[PDB]
Design a protein around this ligand. Structure first.
Ligand SMILES: Nc1ncnc2c1ncn2[C@@H]1O[C@H](COP(=O)(O)OP(=O)(O)O)[C@@H](O)[C@H]1O
Ligand SMILES: Nc1ncnc2c1ncn2[C@@H]1O[C@H](COP(=O)(O)OP(=O)(O)O)[C@@H](O)[C@H]1O
Ligand SMILES: [Zn+2]
Lengths: 45, 317, 658
């Protein structure tokens, strides 16, 4: 579970265009991914 | 008129009786809970002024030589004061009496007489009429799947007196429930997911034979009971009616009993006991009072207590 | 009665939403000192609208108390308790207006295009405290109320129809028929001009659109009534949970039920401080709990510490009363369950193995797992009172181990494999073996509990009945002064505050004391490690009474002493377990002799004619070895003064012989 958090949070850093993160009650909400050309970004690391 | 009646209440309900066989019901109109017509009868006895002995001799007018026991029964019929301490506390104002005695001492006729006299008396023998007859249980209704209470010996005797003959034969499941009834006047049941408490405001009057069947003078008294100290502590006026043969005491009891079966009267001619109808009214009227003692006797009690408290240390050893 | 003037209410709500300040909340509850101008001055519900429009959630939380906290809405508060639907449409329009007015009309941004189409709903939750399920009446129908209770049975997600999909069976034309007020209108003829065959339409089941419906059952008292849940309020309640409900009371033929509108699953401050800093705090609280019971200070403290509890972290304390069957045992337990929320009163033969354990079974039509409650499940978070704990059946006694240590009840039967949670505190009273306590037998032989069970209890109180009139007469006066002719509200207010706000943390210094106390207790060789956590829980419970942010030495030492006093350790022989009924020896006489002689030696050896008692303590008592109580030094010097060997001119000075 704790590994999945760094996975889900890792997506937004490499995808700052389709997912945004904002906090309520101290918890996190995930904005609706507009997935487009998902594969291209992982090669730029 | 909703939320007026409650389970277990004794009420007089006025209504209309309403209906190829028709089914009937009643439409409730007026409800009440439970007098010069009886004040005249009450006046006569207090006019005579003979209160303790006359009523103590009135209960069981066909039983010989038990005046001390009858006096305890007379007080148990009247009862004490149920002092609501407050701050969430509670102290029972009822009297519990145990009648140990040898076979043939008429300690079960008193059980019948107490049930007859009391308006809420319940007569019970054996192991509390088994574990199902004792305490209570929740029973499902096959028609509506609802579960309702079926009152046992103790629950029926609520606000009354429960007589338990042959108390020494009671099982642990029977006697353990007796502890809570004697101490708390309530029954707690946690079965099949139901967690409820039942009102068990009862006066427990138990009569049983010795543990070893009879008493011989060489026998120590505590060996003639199957009951632990906790039960004996919760009892009050714990009697022990030993039978000792005697040509001057068996003669009196035999003469007392033989006159009972010979004529429809008690053997005494100089004393006429109060009839039960008048006894019931006077006891009920007396029960309405709430006496409060004085501080002078309040200091008296703490001296007499210490007097009796210190003696038992020597007596037990 | 359609009392809702729609233009007036939408104007009042416009005023309510666009003008309410968080500051006004502190007025109705009179928390004037709690006014914080740095945050409470800003508008309240505007922040929610800024979030839910950005989060995309179509909901808003309506705290109904703020209607009373604003004057104009007071006329609106009463009518809300009768007409909630109109508010929802107003709020939807208000949100639409908020997007139009506050964003695009203000030219801030344009992130509102889809919002014109989506439907919102605002759910009032914090209606004033209601009268409970058993008090409801027929006149309350259709009026919003509030309830609390326990969840028992939950049905799966039932799909409710909202849109019907019809296809013509001869020309394959597809329609879209919506539901109007719960009715489906089946077309009698195909809508196309060319195809006009009567009764030619057919319903396709799996192309329809459905809405989530969940039926939940709630139990407030042992009564319980059915509840209906819709939409995004699913996946919020499971069997065995405790819920606060704000909903609408309905009836359809008789079938009274709640259209649940909201679901919740989770000045006297100075008066508390005035008691917090007092000196007789512990004695007063201990005495206040049982005004009808004399003395028993240690019994008072632990049972009070039971109500305070430990501190659960990402805690319950259990107590057993062992004593002769005439001493105050039953009365305290009666008080505890009548002073704690939702306590359960239990006895030995009055319960069964499925009495404390909830009867889990499987539904006969929905085949889900359901629970029918139990004594240890009802009192989750509370206190369960068990009388005659010794006379508990062995099977019933067996299931306590998992409950007392893991707070779970696992059941493995035919077709059912699951575990419950029964986190609670246990207060138990046990009569001695036989009739009365016998000091000839060891302590463990007067208790009918096996060591594995006996180790779990945090405190076991040996309540012994003496025959000493020096305490009997005082008890007699306390009893006799009560049958002629802090309060509980302060006490419960105090207790409810501490459990809510106080979360003590053990300090570094207090750590060492717990280690040494257990080591010394273990070194006398029944000192299982379950008693060491008992020390820590009592340590936290003491500071919770103290209302202090930490636990310190005094809390630990008092907790150690309470365990020592409860078990009656020093009065128990360490090699036979027997009780010393006697609790000045020659060894004490020698100790005082040598102490007096050493006081004389120190007084005559120092180069000062006089010295203070603090100076003497610093020179001798605290100089070497652990500090001893100064009373013995005072006793020795008083004896010497009575023998005219030392001069005590005053409390502050001690002077040599004349
Ligand atoms: N003193 C007495 N007066 C009247 N009847 C008596 C007396 N002693 C014994 N009896 C008779 O003997 C019987 C006593 O039996 P019971 O009351 O059942 O005593 P136990 O409880 O010892 O069996 C009664 O039927 C009663 O008629
Ligand atoms: N220290 C005490 N303070 C006040 N009351 C006491 C004390 N010791 C005994 N009592 C009285 O003795 C009675 C004992 O009853 P209770 O403790 O309820 O059950 P049990 O008799 O099994 O101990 C109580 O009614 C109580 O008033
Ligand atoms: Zn067609």
């Amino acid at each position: 579970t704790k590994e999945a958090s760094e996975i889900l949070a890792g997506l937004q850093g490499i995808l700052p265009m389709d997912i945004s993160v904002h906090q309520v009650d101290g918890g996190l909400k995930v904005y609706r991914w507009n997935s487009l050309d998902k594969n291209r970004f992982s090669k730029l690391l | 008129l909703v939320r007026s009646l409650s389970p277990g209440d004794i009420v007089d309900v006025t209504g209309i009786f309403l209906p190829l066989l028709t089914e009937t019901y009643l439409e409730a109109q007026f409800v009440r809970q439970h007098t010069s017509d009886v004040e005249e009868r009450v006046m006569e006895l207090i006019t005579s002024g003979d209160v303790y002995n006359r009523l103590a001799k009135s209960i069981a007018p066909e039983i010989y030589g038990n005046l001390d026991v009858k006096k305890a029964l007379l007080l148990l019929l009247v009862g004490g004061v149920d002092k609501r301490v407050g701050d969430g506390m509670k102290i029972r104002g009822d009297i519990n009496v145990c009648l140990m005695g040898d076979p043939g001492v008429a300690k079960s006729q008193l059980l019948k007489a107490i049930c007859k006299i009391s308006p809420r008396g319940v007569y019970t023998t054996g192991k509390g009429s088994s574990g199902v007859g004792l305490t209570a249980a929740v029973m499902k209704d096959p028609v509506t799947d609802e579960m309702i209470l079926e009152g046992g010996a103790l629950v029926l005797a609520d606000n009354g007196i429960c007589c338990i003959d042959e108390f020494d034969k009671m099982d642990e499941s029977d006697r353990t429930a007796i502890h809570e009834v004697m101490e708390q006047q309530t029954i707690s049941i946690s079965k099949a997911g139901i967690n409820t408490t039942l009102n068990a405001r009862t006066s427990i009057l138990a009569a049983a034979n010795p543990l070893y069947g009879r008493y011989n003078p060489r026998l120590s008294p505590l060996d003639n009971i199957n009951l632990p100290a906790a039960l004996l502590s919760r009892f009050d006026i714990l009697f022990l009616m030993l039978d000792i043969p005697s040509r001057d005491d068996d003669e009196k009891l035999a003469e007392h009993v033989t006159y009972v079966h010979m004529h429809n009267k008690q053997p005494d001619l100089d004393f006429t006991p109060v009839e039960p109808s008048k006894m019931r009214e006077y006891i009920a009227y007396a029960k309405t009072k709430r006496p409060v003692m004085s501080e002078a006797v309040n200091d008296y009690v703490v001296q007499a207590y210490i007097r009796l408290r210190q003696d038992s240390k020597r007596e037990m050893d | 009665g359609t009392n809702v003037s729609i233009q007036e209410c939408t104007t009042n709500f416009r005023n309510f939403l666009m003008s309410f300040k968080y500051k006004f909340r502190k007025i109705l509850d009179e928390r004037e000192e709690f006014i914080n101008n740095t945050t409470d001055e800003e508008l309240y519900y505007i922040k929610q609208l800024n979030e839910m429009r950005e989060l995309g959630t179509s909901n808003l939380n309506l705290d109904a108390r703020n209607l009373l906290a604003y004057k104009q809405t007071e006329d609106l508060y009463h009518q809300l308790l009768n007409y909630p639907q109109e508010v929802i449409s107003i709020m939807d329009q208000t949100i639409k207006d908020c997007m139009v007015s506050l964003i695009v009309d203000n030219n801030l941004d344009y992130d509102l295009d889809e919002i014109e189409t989506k439907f919102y709903k605002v759910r009032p939750y914090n209606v004033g405290s209601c009268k409970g399920m058993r008090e409801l009446n027929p006149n309350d129908i259709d009026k919003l109320i509030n309830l609390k209770g326990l969840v028992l049975r939950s049905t799966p997600v039932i799909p409710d129809m909202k849109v019907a999909f019809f296809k013509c069976n001869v020309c394959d034309h597809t329609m879209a028929v919506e539901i109007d007020r719960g009715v489906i209108q089946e077309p009698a003829r195909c809508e196309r001009i060319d195809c006009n065959e009567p009764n030619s339409m057919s319903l396709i089941h799996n192309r329809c659109s459905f809405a989530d419906k969940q039926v939940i059952k709630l139990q407030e008292t042992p009564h319980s009534i059915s509840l209906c849940v819709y939409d995004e309020l699913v996946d919020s309640c499971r069997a065995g949970d405790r819920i606060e409900v704000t909903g609408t009371f309905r009836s359809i033929p008789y079938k009274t039920y709640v259209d649940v509108v909201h679901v919740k699953k989770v000045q006297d401050l100075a008066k508390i401080r005035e008691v917090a800093a007092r000196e007789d705090l512990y004695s007063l609280l201990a005495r206040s709990i049982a005004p009808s019971i004399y003395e028993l200070e240690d019994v008072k403290k632990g049972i009070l510490l039971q109500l305070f509890g430990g501190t659960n972290k990402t805690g319950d304390i259990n107590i057993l009363l062992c004593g002769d069957p005439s001493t105050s045992k039953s009365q305290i337990l009666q008080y505890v369950h009548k002073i704690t929320p939702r306590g359960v009163y239990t006895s030995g033969k009055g319960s069964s193995a499925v009495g404390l354990t909830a009867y889990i079974t499987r539904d006969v039509d929905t085949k889900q797992l359901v629970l029918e409650s139990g004594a240890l499940v009802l009192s989750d978070g509370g206190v369960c009172c068990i009388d005659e704990f010794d006379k508990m059946s062995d099977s019933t006694r067996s299931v306590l181990h998992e409950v007392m240590e893991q707070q779970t009840i696992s059941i493995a039967k035919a077709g059912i494999i699951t575990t419950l949670n029964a986190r609670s505190s246990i207060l138990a009273s046990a009569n001695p073996i036989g009739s009365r306590y016998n000091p000839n037998l060891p302590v463990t032989e007067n208790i009918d509990l096996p060591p594995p069970l006996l180790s779990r209890f945090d405190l076991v109180y040996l309540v012994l009945d003496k025959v000493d009139e020096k305490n009997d007469r005082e008890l007699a006066k306390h009893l006799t002064n009560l049958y002629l002719e802090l309060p509980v509200e302060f006490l419960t207010m105090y207790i409810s505050y501490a459990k809510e706000h106080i979360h003590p943390i053990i300090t570094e210094a207090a750590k060492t004391e717990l280690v040494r106390a257990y080591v010394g207790m273990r070194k006398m060789g029944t000192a299982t490690t379950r008693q060491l956590e008992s020390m820590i829980r009592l340590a936290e419970a003491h500071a919770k009474m103290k209302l202090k942010n930490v636990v310190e030495l005094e809390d630990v030492q008092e907790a150690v002493r309470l365990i020592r006093s409860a078990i009656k350790d020093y009065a128990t022989d360490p090699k036979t377990g027997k009780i010393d009924m006697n609790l000045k020896s020659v060894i004490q006489r020698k100790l005082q002799e040598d102490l007096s002689r050493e006081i004389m030696n120190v007084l005559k050896d120092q180069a000062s004619d006089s010295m203070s008692f603090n100076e003497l303590i610093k020179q001798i008592n605290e100089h070497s070895q652990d500090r001893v109580e100064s009373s013995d030094i005072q006793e020795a010097l008083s004896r010497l003064q009575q023998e005219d060997k030392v001069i005590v001119l005053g409390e502050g000075v001690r002077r040599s012989v004349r």
